[PDB]
Design a protein around this ligand. Structure first.
Ligand SMILES: *[C@@H]1O[C@H](CO)[C@@H](O[C@@H]2O[C@H](CO)[C@@H](O)[C@H](O)[C@H]2NC(C)=O)[C@H](O)[C@H]1NC(C)=O
Ligand SMILES: *[C@@H]1O[C@H](CO)[C@@H](O[C@@H]2O[C@H](CO)[C@@H](O)[C@H](O)[C@H]2NC(C)=O)[C@H](O)[C@H]1NC(C)=O
Ligand SMILES: *[C@@H]1O[C@H](CO)[C@@H](O)[C@H](O)[C@H]1NC(C)=O
Ligand SMILES: *[C@@H]1O[C@H](CO)[C@@H](O)[C@H](O)[C@H]1NC(C)=O
Ligand SMILES: *[C@@H]1O[C@H](CO)[C@@H](O)[C@H](O)[C@H]1NC(C)=O
Ligand SMILES: *[C@@H]1O[C@H](CO)[C@@H](O)[C@H](O)[C@H]1NC(C)=O
Ligand SMILES: *[C@@H]1O[C@H](CO)[C@@H](O)[C@H](O)[C@H]1NC(C)=O
Ligand SMILES: *[C@@H]1O[C@H](CO)[C@@H](O)[C@H](O)[C@H]1NC(C)=O
Ligand SMILES: *[C@@H]1O[C@H](CO)[C@@H](O)[C@H](O)[C@H]1NC(C)=O
Lengths: 346, 370, 214, 50, 198
């Protein structure tokens, strides 16, 4: 592999280099915040309305209350994650109808009322790139109960007690929170992150930002058209980059694929025998007497409990990682959207 | 479900609701002939273990409780099944192997065993799903002068594969000198005879063995048990007994593309999804009965005792049977809390932008809002 | 005799059981014909010993546009001690014996429609396997060298013969051409579509790419 | 051992989960080293005068 | 004559993969970072590398910390001598005491002891008659050896799952430390930090 292009700085003790021109550039950072909230029923998964398996599972122990408590804590933690990241403004601000912000466009990030869901055009692209599976209660127990010639994994996991709970905040409320944050940032600056919102013209706010980074404010006012055109061209470049390349959102897509493959493995583990004569309880209870079927049902109960505990532990570790990423995203929203940051490469 | 007598404010998942079955159906084929276990069990003579017989039992109803009246054995030795459940399930083909061995060698009629009978005379597969019946016979298989009609094999070049016969009678050649018929010091005939006498010990008595080998459901079923059938009912939560396969669910007419040789359908978790009726050749889907999740929305026990109940993931035109107000939510409908047109902060979360709270109206009740 | 050699591209796939599966990638381990295996082409013309061995399976495939092949006599030693399958295309009977009379004591005799119901070259593929004292005949009539594509083979008939098989010989009655390939224990990955047919399969021993696919 | 391998294939699919977890761990360590050290786009060099 | 633990863990299927970046490449990365830091300042982390003499760069750093830049130019020799003596003291403290690298040495020790106890779990019976599969195969028939092999399989699966779970938790901790190290490299090597005690 190549580490990079070779370079050598022309160092001398009476030589300096000073730039004569700048470049306004718009980047993009994608951070996971929450993941899928799942709910697992033990009696339908391990036993599946068999009375003898239910009696032996009650005779076994109290692991299932612990598993239910862990999954409930994970779901409440993801609701807390989304509420921590997005709900940082106490008032839903609104933009004025006039959209002349000093020559800056801001037309592809502010909402438009054409869609029923008030989302911007870049937000519509970002919701179109991620192919969401298990989005909540979308099946609603009506398509699974009917006759489909090609059954999917969602009905097979629904029939085994493996469900998916919907998030507390709908996407309309998340879009409203981001619209309020954008309106406050455009019309106020950093003054809406301390107290009440203070209006200021956007050119003078941008002069304040240049004074923040160490450049005198006459540079902006004598080059306002060039800076506005560079910002518009950067917005168009990230527009074309999000339209063309489909590999940018591979963190959120990986989160969705990880949850889907975990539920698929949990479904597929039901077909294992675990040393018994069969993997189904009905054939065991119909082909044997009580005493031997007790042993076979005990083997299947132990195997399915071990599989379910493995799933719960992996979900706990993934929830810890997602919570760390959500804390990073909340810090970035607090320090970079609500103010100007002096931290290098943050 | 909390193992306590006081309940704080919040939403709690208690249990699941299930639609209980109402009827019970049994579907068996239209078979009326009787299986001839009698022709197997008393005979004038049996065959030797190297030339064991095999009788095909098919296209008949089988009663396994009349086995005990034909031979004076002790109990069945069943592998894979149990002898008391043989009347409640149906096979496809049942074989019966009959031979006479010594009492030392009855333990070699088990799967996974090696020795003399289970190497060159009669070898069972390791996936055996049958029953071995052996009983003493000293009054019919022994003579005071010696009964020499029973033969067995000692010498063979290789081991027998499971379920195969060798009726060839050729002179063995264990030496390096070929003989081709001369029973010399290195060539022996590999068929010796039991010297059965009545004045032996209990370990050297002849023992008549009947081995029943069962073939499970991979075909249309022919050898069933003695149970009556029931008319087929559809679109209802029942219990079904399709050819010994027991389960609970609803049955609907299917639009699938079953081939003539295929009889069952299976899902990803290897559970039965579709079944073919044994009397009329039609395909029925097996969908489990209606279920879901039940959550309880309550204020504190010190506050009041009013309860709203949420049925997760269903539109409740489908509940079989809390309060009397019904409101629909994306997370399933909420029963017991009225929907107001105001909007406050979230007190008790429900899902999809809906919360619930315990507030007044003018008379305290649980309300739901956005 | 005129022994020749050719390539069996993707044929030999049969249904492993009698369970309906749709939209499921299933993995089975049974006795299949390997992909891109080297099979034998026989241009036997009589104006020639057909005593082939068996070796755990026969692919038997004939490109005959007419019906000039009767059946296959199996067994170890076939010198009028114990014969085998005596299938005739006379549309009346399929007689199976454990006795003599190789060509002109009754074991399981079977009556159905003839195997060659149709009149393009119309390749006939058969599978003869013998495990656990049980014998299966899978067959599929593909209407048209061996062609390209995955054609699944149905269990059209089953047979409880229960005898030992070591050799294999085809009975004709002018010009004939039939293929013989040998089955091996291999692991496959079959693809069931929405109609329950096996439209594609992956052999898990051919190349590392297919092993990665499995 | 053939018998143990047959019983292990008869047991379940735990081992593909273990292999997947260990592979994800190793890829994560490589990503850790890359995101700590590889932060510069070019390889600079000091002049011979020190 | 005396087998090490590496052969005993390699013969049981436990291997160690090499890292993607060799130590020469990491040394090249650190040398490039050092060259950019001492020839350009903080300007090589924003855009192109802009050269500046080191006295003017240190005057920038003192103006960053709140001290006027005439302090350095009147005390340049004293500051350079103090820096050289500090670097010599770091060299002496690294030569004398080896207890400073007790995070990296503990990482190595933790991985080594985890693999060693995973090897040592193969000598346990788990309720069976032997810890050797070959003695179970040779001493019993099919039916009883299936039970003993099932017991050993369950025990070894439990041990290996415990090892995998502990490795996942340690990997999460190591990833958190690596994120902290990346933040420190981005904020303190590539620029001057205003955060107290960072
Ligand atoms: C500073 O850079 C900008 C572009 O980054 C230069 O603007 C370009 O100038 C050329 C020459 O007049 C035009 O053809 C382009 O259309 C301009 N681009 C934009 C986006 O306005 C600008 O001239 C540079 N200034 C100096 C002093 O070099
Ligand atoms: C802000 O950007 C949008 C998006 O490019 C501009 O909308 C385009 O306007 C041109 C000319 O009116 C049309 O040909 C395009 O079809 C529009 N694009 C879209 C997606 O609608 C908009 O004009 C820009 N704002 C200003 C003030 O120029
Ligand atoms: C098969 O079963 C059906 C059940 O209704 C019956 O009507 C029919 O007579 C049976 N066929 C024979 C040949 O007994
Ligand atoms: C067998 O059959 C004969 C005649 O059919 C009968 O007399 C006898 O009691 C039966 N049972 C035994 C054990 O011989
Ligand atoms: C539930 O049933 C009603 C009436 O049948 C129907 O209008 C509705 O679309 C269904 N689904 C939901 C999610 O309410
Ligand atoms: C099959 O084998 C023969 C000789 O064994 C060889 O000549 C022929 O080319 C082979 N066919 C192939 C590899 O397709
Ligand atoms: C019939 O077959 C048996 C072997 O199955 C053989 O012993 C007997 O001789 C045959 N009958 C005749 C008439 O050849
Ligand atoms: C079939 O007969 C042959 C004799 O050539 C014998 O070696 C073999 O063991 C027999 N059984 C089989 C192939 O199952
Ligand atoms: C399944 O069969 C139907 C009916 O002929 C046909 O329309 C459809 O294309 C088939 N599906 C596939 C995948 O071949």
């Amino acid at each position: 592999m190549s580490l990079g292009a070779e370079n050598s700085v022309a160092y001398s003790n009476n030589s300096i280099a000073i730039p004569t021109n700048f470049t306004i550039s718009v980047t993009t950072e994608i951070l996971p915040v929450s993941m899928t909230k799942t709910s697992v029923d033990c009696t339908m998964y391990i036993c599946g309305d068999s009375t003898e398996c239910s009696n032996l599972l009650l005779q076994y122990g109290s692991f299932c209350t612990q598993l239910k408590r862990a999954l409930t804590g994970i779901a409440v933690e993801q609701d807390k994650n989304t509420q921590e990241v997005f709900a940082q403004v106490k008032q839903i601000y609104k933009t004025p109808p006039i959209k002349y912000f000093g020559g800056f466009n801001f037309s592809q990030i502010l909402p438009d009322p054409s869609k029923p869901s008030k989302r911007s055009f870049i937000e519509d692209l970002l919701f179109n790139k991620v192919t969401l599976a298990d989005a909540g209660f979308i099946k609603q127990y009506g398509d699974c109960l009917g006759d489909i010639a090609a059954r999917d994994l969602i009905c097979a996991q629904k029939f085994n007690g493996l469900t998916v709970l919907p998030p507390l905040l709908t996407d309309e409320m998340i879009a409203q929170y981001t619209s309020a944050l954008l309106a406050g940032t455009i019309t106020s600056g950093w003054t809406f992150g301390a107290g009440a919102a203070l209006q200021i013209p956007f050119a003078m706010q941008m002069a304040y930002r240049f004074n923040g980074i160490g450049v005198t404010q006459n540079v902006l006012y004598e080059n306002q058209k060039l800076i506005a055109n560079q910002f518009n061209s950067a917005i168009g470049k990230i527009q074309d980059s999000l339209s063309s390349t489909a590999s940018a959102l591979g963190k959120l897509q990986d989160v969705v694929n990880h949850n889907a493959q975990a539920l698929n493995t949990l479904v597929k583990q039901l077909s294992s025998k675990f040393g018994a004569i069969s993997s189904v309880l009905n054939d065991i209870l119909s082909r044997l007497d009580k005493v031997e079927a007790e042993v076979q049902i005990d083997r299947l109960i132990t195997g399915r409990l071990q599989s379910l505990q493995t799933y719960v532990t992996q979900q706990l570790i993934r929830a810890a990682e997602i919570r760390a990423s959500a804390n990073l995203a909340a810090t970035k929203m607090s320090e970079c959207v609500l103010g100007q940051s002096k931290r290098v490469d943050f | 479900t909390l193992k306590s007598f006081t309940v704080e404010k919040g939403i709690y998942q208690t249990s699941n609701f299930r639609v209980q079955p109402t009827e019970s159906i049994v579907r068996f084929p239209n078979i009326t002939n009787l299986c001839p276990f009698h022709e197997v069990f008393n005979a004038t003579t049996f065959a030797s273990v190297y030339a064991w017989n095999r009788k095909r039992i098919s296209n008949c109803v089988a009663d396994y409780s009349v086995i005990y009246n034909f031979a004076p054995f002790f109990a069945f030795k069943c592998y894979g099944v149990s002898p008391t459940k043989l009347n409640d399930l149906c096979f496809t083909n049942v074989y019966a192997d009959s031979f006479v061995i010594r009492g030392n060698e009855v333990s070699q009629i088990a799967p996974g065993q090696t020795g003399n009978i289970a190497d060159y005379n009669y070898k069972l597969p390791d996936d055996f799903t049958g029953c071995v019946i052996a009983w003493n016979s000293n009054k019919l298989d022994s003579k005071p002068s010696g009964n020499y009609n029973y033969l067995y094999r000692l010498f063979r070049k290789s081991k027998l594969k499971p379920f195969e016969r060798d009726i060839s009678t050729e002179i063995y050649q264990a030496g390096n000198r070929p003989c081709n018929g001369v029973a010399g010091p290195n060539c022996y005939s590999p068929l010796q005879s039991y010297g059965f006498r009545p004045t032996y010990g209990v370990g050297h008595q002849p023992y008549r063995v009947v081995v029943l080998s069962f073939e499970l459901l991979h075909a249309p079923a022919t050898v069933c048990g003695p149970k009556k059938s029931t008319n087929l009912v559809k679109n209802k939560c029942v219990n079904f007994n399709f050819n010994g396969l027991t389960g609970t669910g609803v049955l609907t007419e299917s639009n699938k593309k079953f081939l003539p040789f295929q009889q069952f359908g299976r899902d990803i978790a290897d559970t039965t999804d579709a079944v073919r009726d044994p009397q009329t050749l039609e395909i029925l889907d097996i969908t489990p009965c209606s279920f879901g999740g039940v959550s309880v929305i309550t204020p504190g026990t010190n506050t009041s005792n009013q309860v709203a109940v949420l049925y997760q993931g269903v539109n409740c035109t489908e509940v079989p049977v809390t309060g009397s107000n019904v409101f629909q939510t994306r997370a399933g409908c909420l029963i017991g809390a009225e929907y107001v047109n105001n909007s406050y902060e979230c007190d008790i979360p429900i899902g999809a932008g809906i919360c619930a709270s315990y507030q007044t109206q003018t008379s305290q009740s649980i309300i739901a809002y956005t | 005799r005129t022994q020749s050699y050719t390539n069996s591209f993707t044929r030999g796939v049969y249904y492993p059981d009698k369970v309906f599966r749709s939209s499921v990638l299933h993995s089975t381990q049974d006795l299949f014909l390997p992909f891109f295996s080297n099979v034998t082409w026989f241009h036997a013309i009589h104006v020639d010993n057909p005593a082939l061995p068996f070796n755990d399976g026969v692919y038997f495939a004939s490109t005959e546009k007419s019906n000039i092949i009767r059946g296959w006599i199996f067994g170890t030693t076939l010198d009028s001690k114990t014969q085998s399958l005596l299938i005739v295309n006379n549309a009346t009977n399929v007689v199976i014996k454990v006795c003599e009379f190789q060509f002109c004591n009754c074991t399981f005799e079977y009556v159905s429609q003839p195997f060659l119901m149709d009149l393009f070259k119309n390749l006939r593929e058969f599978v003869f396997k013998n495990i656990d004292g049980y014998f299966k005949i899978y067959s599929k009539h593909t209407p048209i060298d061996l062609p390209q594509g995955f054609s699944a083979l149905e269990p059209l008939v089953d047979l409880p013969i229960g005898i030992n098989i070591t050799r294999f010989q085809t009975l004709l009655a002018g010009a004939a051409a039939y293929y013989v390939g040998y089955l091996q224990p291999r692991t496959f990955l079959l693809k069931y579509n929405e109609n329950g047919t096996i439209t594609d399969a992956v052999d898990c021993a051919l190349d590392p790419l297919s092993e990665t696919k499995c």
